[PDB]
Amino acid sequence: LDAPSQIEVKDVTDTTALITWSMQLSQLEGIELTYGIKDVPGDRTTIDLTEDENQYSIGNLKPDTEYEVSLISRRGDMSSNPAKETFTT
Amino acid sequence: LDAPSQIEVKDVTDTTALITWSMQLSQLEGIELTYGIKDVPGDRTTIDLTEDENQYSIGNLKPDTEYEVSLISRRGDMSSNPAKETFTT
């Protein structure tokens, strides 16, 4: 929808140059992944990830515990309906 | 907005899990950068990057030449009007 914003060539030498830009929040299409012990609802950790990530690895988990993990898409001020999983370490 | 799809918990250990998902192509967003000697016919290098990369670095330009640079956003089959910047090496 929106063109990239800012936009600056920097370090322009004789044979080289760096092109720089931004992207608005408008089209910043993102993944959020929340996770925590399932029956402690207040314990939720959020990870935001680039649209291009297709996986993530949660660490520092407690042995023998059941976890819930919730997964949404986010673009600007629209979010998807959540997608929930539950697993037990 | 479409949620993440598939979605599996894989490789559960006593302290780690792996979450996996994918998104439909429809929803991916990148930048298409095109650059070349401003006013000369032909050439051009065109690069497509993911929304993750805010910068890109270019090389093998001619020592004291004007270039023009064009950046479009892409989300699916839609694109933006371009944003364009000339510069002289």
Residues of chain A numbered 20-39 and touching chain B (CB < 8 Å): 20-23, 27-29, 31, 33
Q: Where are the alpha helices (DSSP H) in A1-65?
A: none
Dihedral angle, C-alpha A49, A54, A60, A66, nearest 10 °: 110
Across the interface, do B3 and A80 touch by the CB < 8 Å criterion?
yes
Q: Which residues pair with B56 in a beta bridge?
A: A19
Tell me chain A's radius of gyration from C-alpha atoms: 19
Minimum Cα–Cα distance from B16: chain A residue: A59
In DSSP terms, B59 is beta-bridged to none
Q: Is the Cβ–Cβ distance between A57 and B17 less than 8 Å? A: yes
Residue pointed to by tokens 């949404």: A72
Domains for chain B: give ranges and CATH numbers.
1-28 (2.20.25.10), 29-89 (2.60.40.10)
Experimental method: X-ray
CA B60/CA A12 separation, integer angstroms: 12
Please identify which residue in the block is written with the tokens 């314990």. A43
CA proximity to A48, closest of A59, A35, A72, A32 = A32
Q: Does B89 touch chain A (CB under 8 A)?
A: yes
Distance CA B59, CA A14 (A): 9
Place of tokens 């439909």: B24
